[PDB]
């Protein structure tokens with residue numbers, strides 16, 4: 252599982268459940284091409300986005316749909332989404348965890364990059 | 368000053384100085400139209416991006432060129448840039464501060480919306 | 483102003499107003515000696531805690547009364563308080579800003595050390 | 598495992614390994630009594646601090662020894678430690694994860710509180 256997303260909720264002190272995530276890869280023409288999507292589980296984790304074979308070098312954008320998450324809880328948040336944009340696998344295959352911590356007017360994000 | 372950007376460095380414990388910041392407004396066709404840009408000051412602040420007259424309701428994107436900032440300090444960073452995307456809504460208070468706190472593999476951002 | 487505290491609210495997107503802040507200095511016997519205190523302003527800032535003459539090298543603790551802040555807004559918070567503990571070192575720059583960003587179950591803090 | 602600590606490193610993009618953690622509980626006399634201690638593993642996680650039986654109601658302080666962590670990497674950091682102080686189990690037993698994200702001049706911390 253080379254690309255995982257984990258999301259926590261800083262208001263409830265809980266995993267952020269049912270957060271939609273869309274991943275894009277920058278194409279040869281410099282547009283954002285849809286790559287994978289999913290939503291976080293009861294643990295706040297999203298597994299199974301991609302495979303080792305399909306997760307090639309490139310510039311990836313992980314869009315975390317924070318506004319849809321907060322609106323679904325009936326909260327009117329500030330941001331449209333949280334975008335995490337990075338070059339992946341340029342030194343060979345790595346495993347990436349994109350972690351995020353959400354509040355209605357703020358988010359934090361970090362990356363955990365490991366070499367299998 | 369309806370829109371301000373303030374950038375801090377969590378490695379050095381300092382303002383993030385001479386960071387490039389580009390602001391875009393979402394157009395009718397869903398493209399990002401250049402809106403304003405500048406470099407953060409010695410205090411990590413970028414003032415004077417827009418006026419009340421130009422800053423209408425809509426969706427704005429603040430792109431912070433974090434990758435150049437880290438490489439100029441000799442540090443290998445994770446992100447291509449930091450993007451903050453939000454709706455300006457007359458209704459809420461009228462002054463927007465977008466604040467960001469940078470580390471090589473992480474950033475935090477918050478909004479301070481007042482008056 | 484050698485020491486400043488700046489508190490922001492990540493739920494409302496605003497300064498954290500009228501937060502109690504207590505500053506202590508570690509004494510020779512490892513106890514915390516009261517040093518300075520105040521409430522954050524309308525801008526979430528607390529200025530004028532100390533002078534250059536009183537602010538000597540040593541270990542300081544900044545205690546932010548986050549629990550009272552949240553309860554006064556009708557919100558149930560996790561922490562008893564937020565504590566920021568650091569050494570003041572003449573060597574490094576001379577002005578310390580302790581900044582905190584508050585949520586009910588979380589906080590972030592950074593230092594901005596300049597001049 | 599009712600009390601866990603997880604720590605990430607925002608500079609290296611990695612778990613924060615070998616972080617010492619000391620937990621205190623406020624005693625009847627209002628002093629901080631040592632309760633448990635340990636250090637984070639290769640995953641950045643610290644398990645096995647306490648038991649359900651021993652983790653009674655109280656006010657707990659989780660001290661994360663950030664200065665010792667950064668000095669052991671030869672970095673001179675700002676903070677002495679990161680203290681996380683909270684009331685636990687006042688509505689019955691819960692499971693607490695104290696998560697932290699470290700930089701030399703900054704840290705974030707959040708709590709994940711679940712009901713078994």
Ligand SMILES: C[C@@H](C(=O)O)c1ccc(-c2cc(Cl)cc(Cl)c2)c(F)c1
Pocket residue numbers: 257258259296348350351352359360361603604605696697698705706707
């Ligand atoms: C438990 C773990 C995961 O399951 O990958 C996870 C998920 C999110 C966070 C986290 C915590 C803080 Cl304090 C800040 C940020 Cl950006 C992420 C974290 F530290 C750890």
Ligand SMILES: C[C@@H](C(=O)O)c1ccc(-c2cc(Cl)cc(Cl)c2)c(F)c1
Pocket residue numbers: 373374375466467468475476477488579581582583590591592594
């Ligand atoms: C106003 C400015 C300062 O006074 O140095 C300031 C104060 C605090 C922050 C801030 C921002 C985030 Cl995103 C997280 C934290 Cl812990 C502090 C910031 F980005 C900028």
